[PDB]
Amino acid sequence: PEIEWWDSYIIFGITNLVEHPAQLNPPVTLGVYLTKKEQKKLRRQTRREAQKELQEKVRLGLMPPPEPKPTKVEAHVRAQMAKRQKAHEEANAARKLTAEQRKVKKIKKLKEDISQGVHISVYRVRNLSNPAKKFKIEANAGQLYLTGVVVLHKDVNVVVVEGGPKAQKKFKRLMLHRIKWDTNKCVLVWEGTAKDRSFGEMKFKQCPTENMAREHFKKHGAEHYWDLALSESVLESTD
Amino acid sequence: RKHTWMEDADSCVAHNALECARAIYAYALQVFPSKKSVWLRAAYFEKNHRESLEALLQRAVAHCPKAEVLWLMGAKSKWLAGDVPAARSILALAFQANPNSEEIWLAAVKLESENDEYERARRLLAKARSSAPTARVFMKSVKLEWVQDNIRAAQDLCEEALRHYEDFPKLWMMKGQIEEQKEMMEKAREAYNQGLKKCPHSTPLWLLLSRLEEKIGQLTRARAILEKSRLKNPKNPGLWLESVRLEYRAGLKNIANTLMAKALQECPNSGILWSEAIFLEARPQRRTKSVDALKKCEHDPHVLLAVAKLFWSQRKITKAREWFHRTVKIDSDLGDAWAFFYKFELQHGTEEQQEEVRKRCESAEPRHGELWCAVSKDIANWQKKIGDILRLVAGRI
Amino acid sequence: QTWYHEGPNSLKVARLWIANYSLPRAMKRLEEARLHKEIPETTRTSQMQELHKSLRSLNNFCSQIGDDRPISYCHFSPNSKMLATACWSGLCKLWSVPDCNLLHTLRGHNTNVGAIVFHPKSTVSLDPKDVNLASCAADGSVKLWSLDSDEPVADIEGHTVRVARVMWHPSGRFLGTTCYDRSWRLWDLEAQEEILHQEGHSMGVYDIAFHQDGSLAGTGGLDAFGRVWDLRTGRCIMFLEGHLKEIYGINFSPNGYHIATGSGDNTCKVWDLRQRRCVYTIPAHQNLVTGVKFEPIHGNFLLTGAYDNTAKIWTHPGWSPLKTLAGHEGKVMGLDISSDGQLIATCSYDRTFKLWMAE
Amino acid sequence: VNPKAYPLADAHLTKKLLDLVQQSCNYKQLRKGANEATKTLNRGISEFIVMAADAEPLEIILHLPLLCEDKNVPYVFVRSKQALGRACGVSRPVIACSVTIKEGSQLKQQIQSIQQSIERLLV
């Protein structure tokens, strides 16, 4: 390179002009807590207006008042306490998270808000050709809404995981403590954050030699995880 | 039934009586000549409860061959009780009994090295150095030419020993200590450094390189050696306590206290670091730092030694004596727990209490104490008896 | 929306001075790089394997406590004999290195000191009496020091909030200063007047690093966007982003290509300047990356600090992890490599500063 | 705010902080008060210290950063003492809280994540 391009821009381009360039945005709500006495007071006043509005609806006369509580009399009250326990099971029967409201609330528990930046684990394992452990990795990456890849190679196979931080902590609890591996160990190679998510979903790509695995990573703009895990693997193998 | 008799004999010897235990041992070993453990239990019982040592070990040398622990128990019993000049003969019959060269040979050099005429203790080890021994043998050989005076041959034997046995770190410790007692001292740095780059997860060798580079000046390099040690192991109390003591031996008491806090962060249930942390606090605050130490690591001998040293430090002798008794009974194998105990009982107590604290130390002979192994590895104080060792640690406090 | 503002003519004469100082430096650097390219690749690759055999044998020696407060920054002097540390108390100690004896602590700060930076002509071309050091603090404070006074010489009062870092121009006549005004100032030593107050970030600016030929000055701050300013034109030359978290360290390479911005998202990112790209995003550490420093004059490797307890050596170019300089018990706050390449120091939150060397 | 209050937690971090302090109040892992935070720092049983930047004067808790550097404990400043006090389950303002270690309690993962996050704030 003959002269680097700012030097070619000036050789004259200077005078007494300092400038304010193109400000770019960097790439809130607070919960309310109550003391226990305030919980008692809020509960008791909500209940006092609840009793007041139930007695109000009795005062309007929409309905007779609710159920107040030798074989014949407590047989009546047995049918009425069956009615009472049945109404408790009715109020538990509705408001039940029927079959898929559990599913959408488990989803909104597990699917975080990743824009605001995605936390990335990179692991290397010496060998995960075991079917059960590659199933645990694939299924728990899909189920924790974690994205990424497991490229497969001899002596260093790379698990790039990419999701929200509460899922990343569960995946490192899985990968480092829950999956019992054994000379075969799994380490945490990297645990960082990138701007937004790179991979598609947890797909076990594979090539037995290193250059095509780096090419598959370079397709995603993520070759640095491969070069890092490969280089620290071969440095552990030499040391 | 043999396991039942051994359990009932242990319970009877613990609770009430001894002669019923002698009778059940005579019966249970007249049922069969047995494994090494039952003769061993009879011999240990009689070593707790003098002529019957010779009787039972003679029956063991008759009816139980290849139980060499009974052979060495017999040889030590004929050393202490009767005297020397036949037990070697008895060990010579062990020479007639076992050509396996593992433990009887360095027992023999213990025998002829306690006494005069160590040149015989040369030539025998010569035999052992070609016989069939784990170069454990060699370190006794390296102690051989170290206790009289180190020759250049004393540097030669450890070098040939490491040329055989690079992996063993106590040989590197002996090479470094020998080079420390030579004239200059970076040869000992070379020895410790090569050992620590080859052994490498052995904490007393890191402690030796630390104390060496602290002693010659450049305390910063000693802090670097200890910090390499705390990384390369990691998470052990023995290097954390030496780092704390390195800052406390210099003027940096605040940095010693924050390294003690960092140490108790990552290894809370450890005796030595809490026993140092009680000492590091200001004296009105040791009273509850010690209570937290008892709650983290209860039934630890270093911690109860620290509580006894606290009660003696606050001059409450009636509680310090009880806590020292608890210290020595939780673990009597710790040497400093007898050091402070005899120094306290010579500071406070009748003459028969000093009698007591030198009864029970020679009863169960200790190890593992850093003052105790600080004089038990002084080669000027190496082959001397254990009351002399307890007096030497009690005078150096 | 690039807004322009008229400055004083002190800025104009300073920019023509920076031009006529930087252009011969850039010509000489490019010609020496052209002479370094024309020698055969056997000698060059054998020299880099020589250097990597040395750099994998970087062992720690002379780790020394700085204060009862965690040290925030070290900067090797030229002549590489002193080492200015910056504690989180007011003190800015100066250790005689590699011996690590203390030499005349600098008192005169109150809140947490950020960087203390030696002059580029401190030992070599600057007398001890003349200004030699420049510290900065967590209040509005930048203040120059001599090597023999222990209480400063004339401070800088253009600041009102926390100044994060300070760096000199490779001249020494200029003193870049990231403030938390979402801006960085550029003080001058001949005129003794703040010539430039560049606002170009949306959030506060953390670290400034000047090009070793003197022409450029990269910044980068809590807005996660690093800038590359020319001193001569204002005119942010290569806006660089891809970090999402707060960029905590810039350094320019002695070969004029690269800028390694280390950020709060545990990456480091090596950017070109002749490509305007992000050449390689080093997945550096487990926690955030504060100190990023290339080697001096030859510039063959890249040392990253960390808020895990490590600091790592990456080859340059290639970015493979030559050696983790681990061993600290706290977060590595700042570092510097000596100007001969032989010595490497990292301060930390462990209250220590160390030295790593070839064995 | 006060410039000596350092590090200062932003809005997302202080929301996580006050929810963790609320959970520790529920799990009985929380010691409210500058004297109780000083005590649990001295006893070494503190996971982390939160403090209040709107404590006037600030220096009645500014000894607690120094204790958090001599005990290796993460410390962080919340914006105001009223929100921190309500986050401890008391209606009074609380200027310094100590979330403390307990025997394998279920907040240890949240406490570890918040420890790693507020040791990034002092930079």
Side-chain angles (χ1 to χ4, degrees), chain A, chain B residues 5 9 14 17-49 55 60 62 65-397, chain C, chain D:
Chain A
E2 49 149 21
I3 51 175
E4 303 186 25
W5 46 282
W6 48 90
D7 301 325
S8 68
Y9 168 67
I10 299 162
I11 201 182
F12 289 78
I14 71 169
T15 187
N16 48 353
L17 276 181
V18 73
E19 59 100 10
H20 294 61
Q23 178 76 207
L24 300 177
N25 300 169
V28 175
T29 303
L30 181 44
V32 175
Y33 307 92
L34 276 83
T35 187
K36 293 291 189 292
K37 188 179 292 291
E38 275 159 358
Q39 311 264 28
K40 295 288 180 65
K41 195 167 191 289
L42 174 64
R43 170 196 194 264
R44 196 189 316 117
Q45 286 178 181
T46 287
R47 281 174 79 84
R48 261 167 62 207
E49 62 87 19
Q51 303 324 302
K52 272 286 190 302
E53 68 98 15
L54 263 300
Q55 282 171 19
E56 170 62 85
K57 291 304 163 57
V58 169
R59 273 149 169 80
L60 306 181
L62 273 72
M63 66 185 75
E67 195 273 329
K69 166 145 198 192
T71 311
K72 164 134 183 160
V73 283
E74 192 62 28
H76 305 153
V77 187
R78 164 183 63 163
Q80 274 110 36
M81 195 177 77
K83 171 80 168 180
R84 175 184 273 176
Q85 270 158 350
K86 208 192 185 194
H88 163 236
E89 296 296 328
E90 282 169 352
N92 295 21
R95 191 178 41 93
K96 189 54 184 72
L97 299 177
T98 73
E100 78 271 27
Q101 302 191 197
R102 280 181 288 117
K103 172 177 172 188
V104 71
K105 251 155 187 165
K106 211 166 194 170
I107 278 179
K108 71 177 71 176
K109 159 190 176 52
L110 290 156
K111 184 149 198 167
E112 313 101 309
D113 57 1
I114 64 163
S115 179
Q116 293 294 109
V118 59
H119 288 43
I120 297 173
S121 283
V122 171
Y123 307 108
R124 81 174 184 272
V125 187
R126 186 148 296 188
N127 192 312
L128 59 95
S129 44
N130 199 313
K133 287 162 205 199
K134 76 153 54 181
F135 166 70
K136 290 180 202 181
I137 287 153
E138 186 266 332
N140 290 280
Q143 275 152 358
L144 290 159
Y145 288 121
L146 292 157
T147 313
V149 73
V150 180
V151 311
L152 291 171
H153 196 269
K154 40 191 67 178
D155 191 272
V156 49
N157 43 53
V158 167
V159 183
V160 177
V161 185
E162 199 157 359
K166 292 153 183 56
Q168 284 284 337
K169 192 57 72 178
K170 293 209 216 73
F171 203 88
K172 93 180 298 185
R173 178 72 196 176
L174 170 127
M175 202 86 172
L176 257 61
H177 309 313
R178 265 173 57 208
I179 291 186
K180 301 305 201 309
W181 299 97
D182 51 301
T183 192
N184 170 74
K185 75 159 60 180
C186 162
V187 301
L188 166 70
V189 165
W190 193 61
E191 215 188 16
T193 303
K195 179 58 177 284
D196 54 2
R197 175 182 269 168
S198 196
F199 290 91
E201 183 74 48
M202 202 65 143
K203 274 135 56 184
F204 278 72
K205 209 92 186 178
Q206 178 161 17
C207 196
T209 199
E210 287 151 355
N211 212 342
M212 277 81 89
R214 204 175 102 84
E215 173 68 33
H216 159 68
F217 265 115
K218 202 189 181 175
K219 288 167 194 159
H220 293 263
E223 69 273 10
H224 43 281
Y225 312 136
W226 174 248
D227 269 313
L228 178 69
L230 171 140
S231 300
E232 312 172 281
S233 68
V234 71
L235 273 184
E236 185 181 1
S237 191
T238 52
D239 290 332
Chain B
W5 299 335
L18 315 180
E19 269 68 32
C20 85
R22 277 176 195 160
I24 200 176
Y25 278 156
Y27 166 68
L29 278 80
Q30 86 185 357
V31 173
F32 35 65
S34 66
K35 281 88 66 184
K36 77 169 180 68
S37 181
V38 198
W39 292 88
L40 197 68
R41 195 156 304 272
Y44 280 164
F45 154 81
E46 204 276 338
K47 208 257 168 180
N48 279 8
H49 313 288
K66 282 90 195 174
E68 290 85 5
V69 190
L70 267 296
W71 273 114
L72 268 82
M73 275 282 285
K76 284 185 172 172
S77 85
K78 275 92 169 185
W79 187 277
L80 301 190
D83 210 70
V84 181
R88 41 179 66 186
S89 177
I90 294 171
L91 202 141
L93 195 64
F95 283 168
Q96 283 289 330
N98 304 130
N100 311 325
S101 300
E102 301 91 8
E103 291 96 3
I104 299 172
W105 262 250
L106 74 152
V109 312
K110 170 189 73 85
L111 302 190
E112 277 88 7
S113 64
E114 283 165 86
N115 298 109
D116 208 357
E117 303 292 323
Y118 86 109
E119 53 162 344
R120 177 184 172 190
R122 295 190 292 177
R123 313 299 174 84
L124 269 65
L125 257 181
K127 185 76 63 63
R129 280 169 50 191
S130 181
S131 180
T134 63
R136 167 190 189 175
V137 171
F138 266 92
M139 89 187 175
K140 294 292 162 309
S141 175
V142 165
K143 273 164 156 156
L144 188 156
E145 311 204 325
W146 189 20
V147 64
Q148 318 290 125
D149 44 26
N150 61 40
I151 326 291
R152 200 57 212 276
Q155 316 277 355
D156 296 347
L157 293 185
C158 63
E159 183 67 28
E160 299 291 324
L162 290 162
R163 262 282 298 256
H164 291 63
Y165 268 62
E166 295 292 332
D167 194 16
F168 207 48
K170 192 104 189 195
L171 270 59
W172 295 107
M173 274 191 266
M174 272 161 211
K175 179 155 100 170
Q177 288 277 116
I178 277 163
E179 288 276 2
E180 277 189 33
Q181 277 106 33
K182 212 189 156 64
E183 55 96 19
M184 69 181 179
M185 207 169 293
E186 66 266 24
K187 262 182 178 171
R189 273 164 69 205
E190 182 178 0
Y192 288 145
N193 186 210
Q194 185 176 67
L196 283 168
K197 87 185 187 84
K198 285 182 200 222
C199 77
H201 299 254
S202 69
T203 91
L205 190 59
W206 283 112
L207 304 190
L208 257 58
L209 188 47
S210 169
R211 291 157 135 91
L212 177 63
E213 266 290 348
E214 186 195 298
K215 182 254 289 182
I216 64 169
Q218 295 287 336
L219 188 143
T220 73
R221 199 179 298 245
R223 210 195 330 268
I225 286 309
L226 266 174
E227 197 161 4
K228 268 207 277 188
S229 76
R230 296 201 317 275
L231 180 65
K232 281 284 278 295
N233 284 36
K235 209 186 280 289
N236 79 310
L239 301 167
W240 270 110
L241 183 139
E242 194 39 61
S243 63
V244 163
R245 280 185 176 161
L246 188 143
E247 319 277 357
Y248 184 74
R249 276 188 228 113
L252 315 158
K253 281 172 285 298
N254 321 326
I255 321 293
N257 215 332
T258 189
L259 278 184
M260 172 55 63
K262 274 164 196 161
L264 296 174
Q265 273 291 325
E266 44 186 66
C267 50
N269 308 301
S270 174
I272 44 171
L273 281 170
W274 280 105
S275 71
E276 185 81 42
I278 295 157
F279 161 70
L280 272 182
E281 282 278 73
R283 54 176 315 279
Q285 308 157 7
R286 310 176 157 162
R287 195 249 175 179
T288 76
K289 178 69 72 181
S290 73
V291 162
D292 291 6
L294 296 190
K295 187 170 73 69
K296 290 295 171 184
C297 40
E298 210 177 63
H299 321 293
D300 193 281
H302 298 268
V303 189
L304 313 193
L305 173 68
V307 185
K309 280 201 293 179
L310 199 153
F311 280 135
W312 177 21
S313 180
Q314 288 175 347
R315 306 203 36 84
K316 319 180 182 310
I317 55 171
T318 62
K319 213 158 168 51
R321 192 165 283 122
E322 169 183 16
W323 269 95
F324 262 123
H325 283 113
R326 207 183 322 265
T327 301
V328 307
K329 188 49 69 182
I330 288 298
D331 189 89
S332 68
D333 204 8
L334 199 153
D336 311 335
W338 300 103
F340 293 111
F341 189 38
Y342 178 51
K343 205 205 177 199
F344 164 66
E345 285 279 39
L346 65 91
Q347 188 172 319
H348 303 297
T350 52
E351 298 290 325
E352 217 275 344
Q353 309 218 60
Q354 307 180 6
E355 292 264 324
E356 303 182 283
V357 309
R358 85 169 176 275
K359 298 293 104 171
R360 254 191 311 173
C361 172
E362 68 185 359
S363 310
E365 63 271 17
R367 224 165 293 180
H368 309 145
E370 209 173 340
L371 302 173
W372 193 272
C373 294
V375 316
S376 296
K377 270 76 203 172
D378 282 329
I379 301 300
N381 296 2
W382 157 248
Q383 63 272 24
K384 46 172 56 51
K385 297 310 171 65
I386 203 153
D388 204 1
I389 281 177
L390 177 138
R391 293 157 174 198
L392 261 291
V393 294
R396 280 187 189 170
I397 290 167
Chain C
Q1 329 170 9
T2 55
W3 182 48
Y4 269 48
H5 168 56
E6 273 184 324
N9 52 0
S10 63
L11 177 136
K12 183 199 184 193
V13 297
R15 283 171 174 203
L16 204 163
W17 196 85
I18 287 174
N20 222 23
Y21 170 65
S22 73
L23 265 74
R25 258 197 183 273
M27 295 305 182
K28 190 159 54 192
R29 179 187 48 79
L30 267 175
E31 196 58 48
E32 196 271 329
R34 202 166 285 113
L35 190 144
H36 193 41
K37 191 46 187 291
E38 74 173 45
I39 60 184
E41 204 262 341
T42 78
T43 66
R44 281 211 305 273
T45 295
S46 178
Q47 273 189 8
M48 284 182 187
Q49 291 298 324
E50 210 179 301
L51 187 47
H52 297 173
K53 194 190 180 184
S54 68
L55 284 183
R56 291 187 187 94
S57 49
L58 281 174
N59 77 317
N60 177 30
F61 85 105
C62 276
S63 68
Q64 198 189 20
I65 317 293
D67 215 352
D68 59 285
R69 301 285 289 170
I71 327 177
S72 164
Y73 193 93
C74 40
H75 190 278
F76 265 108
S77 91
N79 179 224
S80 176
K81 280 199 176 55
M82 272 174 293
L83 201 149
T85 59
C87 305
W88 267 11
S89 49
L91 275 84
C92 298
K93 305 160 179 278
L94 263 77
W95 317 86
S96 66
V97 157
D99 288 330
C100 299
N101 318 310
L102 184 139
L103 298 182
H104 52 57
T105 80
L106 306 182
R107 292 175 195 86
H109 272 303
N110 314 109
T111 324
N112 316 336
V113 186
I116 173 161
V117 183
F118 263 99
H119 203 91
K121 301 194 59 182
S122 178
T123 297
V124 298
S125 297
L126 269 189
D127 79 340
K129 285 190 174 181
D130 292 21
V131 65
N132 275 309
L133 294 143
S135 67
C136 82
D139 54 354
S141 283
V142 174
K143 54 181 70 176
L144 321 169
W145 314 81
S146 171
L147 298 178
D148 49 354
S149 179
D150 298 29
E151 195 174 1
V153 305
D155 315 343
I156 316 299
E157 316 105 337
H159 301 274
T160 181
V161 286
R162 166 168 192 249
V163 166
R165 289 263 198 277
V166 153
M167 254 293 299
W168 300 83
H169 200 261
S171 179
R173 277 189 64 246
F174 297 88
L175 196 138
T177 299
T178 79
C179 190
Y180 280 177
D181 288 333
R182 317 159 43 209
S183 75
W184 63 276
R185 300 176 170 80
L186 182 81
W187 203 68
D188 176 84
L189 264 79
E190 185 264 352
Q192 196 177 1
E193 197 271 332
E194 168 190 328
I195 71 152
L196 185 139
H197 173 273
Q198 190 93 66
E199 184 177 3
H201 297 254
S202 67
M203 282 176 65
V205 194
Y206 200 84
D207 193 294
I208 185 172
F210 287 75
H211 209 314
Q212 304 290 331
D213 43 43
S215 63
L216 268 57
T219 60
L222 315 179
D223 58 323
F225 309 123
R227 309 301 214 116
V228 174
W229 315 90
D230 203 328
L231 278 314
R232 280 90 41 96
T233 57
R235 265 276 180 87
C236 165
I237 288 297
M238 199 260 302
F239 181 84
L240 55 91
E241 69 94 17
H243 293 301
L244 80 148
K245 277 189 171 188
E246 304 91 1
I247 289 182
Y248 286 128
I250 315 288
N251 208 25
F252 275 67
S253 302
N255 43 353
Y257 287 101
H258 295 282
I259 303 153
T261 79
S263 51
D265 64 337
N266 319 346
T267 43
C268 181
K269 268 186 213 300
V270 188
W271 314 78
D272 209 295
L273 273 157
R274 317 184 202 168
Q275 301 183 34
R276 317 186 202 185
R277 220 174 71 210
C278 175
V279 173
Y280 195 84
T281 159
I282 306 171
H285 292 280
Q286 303 295 321
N287 204 356
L288 61 90
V289 178
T290 35
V292 172
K293 184 86 199 295
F294 281 95
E295 184 193 78
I297 305 298
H298 303 275
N300 287 316
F301 68 95
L302 206 163
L303 160 73
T304 60
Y307 270 17
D308 58 287
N309 311 329
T310 59
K312 290 177 194 190
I313 302 294
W314 319 84
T315 177
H316 187 64
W319 307 287
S320 62
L322 276 180
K323 181 158 210 59
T324 300
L325 272 58
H328 284 282
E329 286 309 299
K331 311 173 282 295
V332 176
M333 316 183 61
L335 42 84
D336 210 74
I337 313 180
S338 69
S339 299
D340 61 348
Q342 292 176 2
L343 205 49
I344 286 165
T346 76
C347 282
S348 62
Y349 184 86
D350 196 14
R351 299 100 172 275
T352 83
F353 85 105
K354 312 208 188 324
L355 290 173
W356 282 266
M357 217 171 76
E359 60 93 18
Chain D
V1 290
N2 223 321
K4 287 191 295 180
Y6 175 77
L8 187 65
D10 50 333
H12 320 291
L13 178 60
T14 191
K15 174 183 155 308
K16 301 176 225 171
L17 271 174
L18 293 201
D19 188 57
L20 182 55
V21 158
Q22 168 67 255
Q23 281 171 39
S24 297
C25 166
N26 301 334
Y27 273 84
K28 310 288 201 316
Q29 277 186 255
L30 183 70
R31 267 85 194 172
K32 315 154 273 274
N35 305 288
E36 267 181 281
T38 300
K39 280 198 280 197
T40 65
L41 272 170
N42 270 340
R43 307 284 294 276
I45 67 164
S46 90
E47 296 268 8
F48 69 101
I49 300 286
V50 298
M51 278 165 288
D54 288 331
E56 183 66 30
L58 180 57
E59 305 157 7
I60 68 187
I61 48 179
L62 220 63
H63 79 280
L64 285 185
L66 274 81
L67 265 179
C68 287
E69 293 171 348
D70 305 358
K71 297 294 167 196
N72 200 36
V73 162
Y75 67 101
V76 63
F77 281 81
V78 183
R79 274 306 195 112
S80 179
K81 42 172 188 176
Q82 198 58 239
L84 180 56
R86 297 309 289 270
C88 300
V90 285
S91 62
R92 288 308 302 241
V94 173
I95 63 187
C97 311
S98 177
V99 177
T100 45
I101 323 181
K102 208 201 252 195
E103 301 91 6
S105 84
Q106 282 186 214
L107 307 187
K108 186 49 196 168
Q109 220 72 32
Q110 301 187 60
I111 281 163
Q112 264 182 5
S113 177
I114 289 298
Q115 274 187 24
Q116 301 307 303
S117 159
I118 70 188
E119 274 179 342
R120 291 168 53 109
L121 260 290
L122 57 97
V123 73

PDB file of all heavy atoms in Angstrom, chain A residues 30 32 62 78 95 116-117:
ATOM      1  N   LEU A  30     -40.087  -0.685  36.753  1.00  0.00           N
ATOM      2  CA  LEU A  30     -39.674  -1.203  38.052  1.00  0.00           C
ATOM      3  C   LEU A  30     -40.839  -1.829  38.808  1.00  0.00           C
ATOM      4  O   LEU A  30     -41.905  -1.228  38.933  1.00  0.00           O
ATOM      5  CB  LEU A  30     -39.031  -0.102  38.895  1.00  0.00           C
ATOM      6  CG  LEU A  30     -38.542  -0.540  40.277  1.00  0.00           C
ATOM      7  CD1 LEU A  30     -37.799  -1.864  40.195  1.00  0.00           C
ATOM      8  CD2 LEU A  30     -37.672   0.533  40.914  1.00  0.00           C
ATOM      9  N   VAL A  32     -43.166  -3.251  41.867  1.00  0.00           N
ATOM     10  CA  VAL A  32     -43.556  -2.670  43.144  1.00  0.00           C
ATOM     11  C   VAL A  32     -43.673  -3.748  44.210  1.00  0.00           C
ATOM     12  O   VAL A  32     -44.409  -4.720  44.050  1.00  0.00           O
ATOM     13  CB  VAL A  32     -44.901  -1.931  43.037  1.00  0.00           C
ATOM     14  CG1 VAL A  32     -45.351  -1.447  44.406  1.00  0.00           C
ATOM     15  CG2 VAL A  32     -44.793  -0.771  42.060  1.00  0.00           C
ATOM     16  N   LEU A  62     -80.623 -10.154  43.574  1.00  0.00           N
ATOM     17  CA  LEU A  62     -80.417 -11.066  42.451  1.00  0.00           C
ATOM     18  C   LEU A  62     -80.481 -12.522  42.892  1.00  0.00           C
ATOM     19  O   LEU A  62     -81.060 -13.361  42.195  1.00  0.00           O
ATOM     20  CB  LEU A  62     -79.076 -10.788  41.763  1.00  0.00           C
ATOM     21  CG  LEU A  62     -78.966  -9.746  40.645  1.00  0.00           C
ATOM     22  CD1 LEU A  62     -79.090  -8.325  41.152  1.00  0.00           C
ATOM     23  CD2 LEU A  62     -77.653  -9.931  39.895  1.00  0.00           C
ATOM     24  N   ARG A  78     -74.642 -32.807  54.079  1.00  0.00           N
ATOM     25  CA  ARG A  78     -73.654 -33.571  53.322  1.00  0.00           C
ATOM     26  C   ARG A  78     -73.773 -33.278  51.836  1.00  0.00           C
ATOM     27  O   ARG A  78     -72.759 -33.094  51.155  1.00  0.00           O
ATOM     28  CB  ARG A  78     -73.827 -35.068  53.594  1.00  0.00           C
ATOM     29  CG  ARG A  78     -73.122 -35.984  52.591  1.00  0.00           C
ATOM     30  CD  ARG A  78     -73.384 -37.465  52.847  1.00  0.00           C
ATOM     31  NE  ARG A  78     -74.795 -37.820  52.697  1.00  0.00           N
ATOM     32  CZ  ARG A  78     -75.247 -39.062  52.549  1.00  0.00           C
ATOM     33  NH1 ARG A  78     -74.402 -40.084  52.522  1.00  0.00           N
ATOM     34  NH2 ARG A  78     -76.547 -39.285  52.422  1.00  0.00           N
ATOM     35  N   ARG A  95     -60.143 -21.680  35.400  1.00  0.00           N
ATOM     36  CA  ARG A  95     -58.858 -21.105  35.819  1.00  0.00           C
ATOM     37  C   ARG A  95     -57.869 -22.223  36.160  1.00  0.00           C
ATOM     38  O   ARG A  95     -57.519 -22.447  37.320  1.00  0.00           O
ATOM     39  CB  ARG A  95     -59.044 -20.110  36.979  1.00  0.00           C
ATOM     40  CG  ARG A  95     -57.858 -19.256  37.353  1.00  0.00           C
ATOM     41  CD  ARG A  95     -58.241 -18.306  38.476  1.00  0.00           C
ATOM     42  NE  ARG A  95     -59.089 -18.940  39.487  1.00  0.00           N
ATOM     43  CZ  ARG A  95     -58.642 -19.513  40.601  1.00  0.00           C
ATOM     44  NH1 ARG A  95     -57.347 -19.545  40.863  1.00  0.00           N
ATOM     45  NH2 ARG A  95     -59.494 -20.052  41.457  1.00  0.00           N
ATOM     46  N   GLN A 116     -31.727  -6.874  22.336  1.00  0.00           N
ATOM     47  CA  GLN A 116     -30.890  -6.657  23.529  1.00  0.00           C
ATOM     48  C   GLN A 116     -29.798  -7.710  23.654  1.00  0.00           C
ATOM     49  O   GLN A 116     -29.269  -7.921  24.745  1.00  0.00           O
ATOM     50  CB  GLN A 116     -31.647  -6.636  24.865  1.00  0.00           C
ATOM     51  CG  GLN A 116     -32.600  -5.476  25.067  1.00  0.00           C
ATOM     52  CD  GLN A 116     -31.904  -4.143  25.145  1.00  0.00           C
ATOM     53  OE1 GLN A 116     -31.993  -3.327  24.229  1.00  0.00           O
ATOM     54  NE2 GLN A 116     -31.221  -3.902  26.256  1.00  0.00           N
ATOM     55  N   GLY A 117     -29.459  -8.390  22.574  1.00  0.00           N
ATOM     56  CA  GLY A 117     -28.192  -9.089  22.506  1.00  0.00           C
ATOM     57  C   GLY A 117     -28.246 -10.498  23.056  1.00  0.00           C
ATOM     58  O   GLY A 117     -28.880 -10.777  24.079  1.00  0.00           O
TER      59      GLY A 117
END
